[PDB]
Amino acid sequence: GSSGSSGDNMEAVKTFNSELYSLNDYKPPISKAKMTQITKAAIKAIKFYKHVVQSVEKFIQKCKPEYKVPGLYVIDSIVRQSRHQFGQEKDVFAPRFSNNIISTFQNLYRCPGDDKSKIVRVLNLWQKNNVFKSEIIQPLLDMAAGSGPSSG
């Protein structure tokens, strides 16, 4: 006979909670299609994004030094969409991530360094697309260099 459900409390989230960490399944770089599979879940759980954002910041600390680049992308791919779909003034991940954005990047800048480029490249795009204020990215651009570029 028939069979089906109507979802459960905070269904949108749980869904994203899988795509976010799912990254583990794939090794950097992450399948262009994958990065999207996550955004679709986040932008969908916008109503409860409160959980998403957090997970996006945690998974970064839990992941491996190699998965420090991916995370950053996940945040961008999301903020970019929400900022558009719903709008900049409506966006929730942009203004929400900017809160502890630093602490979030710190866990990403931990990479051996040969992956920082993938992290610093995002900042350049954000400031351009107007995703984040220069007063927020300005510092994020340095965090990568770490008290200046390694000169030896």
79: nearest Cα among 102, 59, 111, 101? 101
| Alpha helices in the chain, H assignment, sequence order | 11-22, 32-44, 49-62, 68-85, 93-106, 116-129, 134-145
Please give the distance of CA 143 from its chain centroid, rounded to a whole number. Answer: 17
Distance CA 19, CA 34 (A): 8
Structure determined by: NMR
Distance CA 106, CA 74 (A): 16
Kindly list the domain boundaries of the chain, sorted by start residue: 8-148
Interhelix angle for 68-85 vs 116-129, to 10°? 10
Cα atoms in the Cβ-side hemisphere of radius 13 Å centred on 143: 21
In sequence order, what are the residues at sequence separation of 6 or more whose Cβ sits closer than 8 angstroms to the Cβ of residue 110?
A: 65, 68
Q: For the beta carbon of residue 38, count every other beta carbon within 10 angstroms.
A: 25
Can you tell me whether residue 97 is helix, strand or coil?
helix
In sequence order, what are the residues at sequence separation of 6 or more whose Cβ sits closer than 8 angstroms to the Cβ of residue 67?
A: 23, 24, 28, 60
Identify the DSSP state of 144: H
Cα distance from N-terminal residue to C-terminal residue, the chain: 72
Can you tell me whether residue 11 is helix, strand or coil?
helix
Distance CA 48, CA 133 (A): 24
Distance CA 38, CA 13 (A): 11
CATH number, domain 8-148: 1.25.40.90
Note whether 101 and 68 are within 8 A (CB). Answer: no
C-alpha distances in Å from residue 17, one per residue of 42, 54, 56, 62, 111: 9, 10, 9, 13, 23
Q: How is residue 122 written in tokens?
A: 């995002």
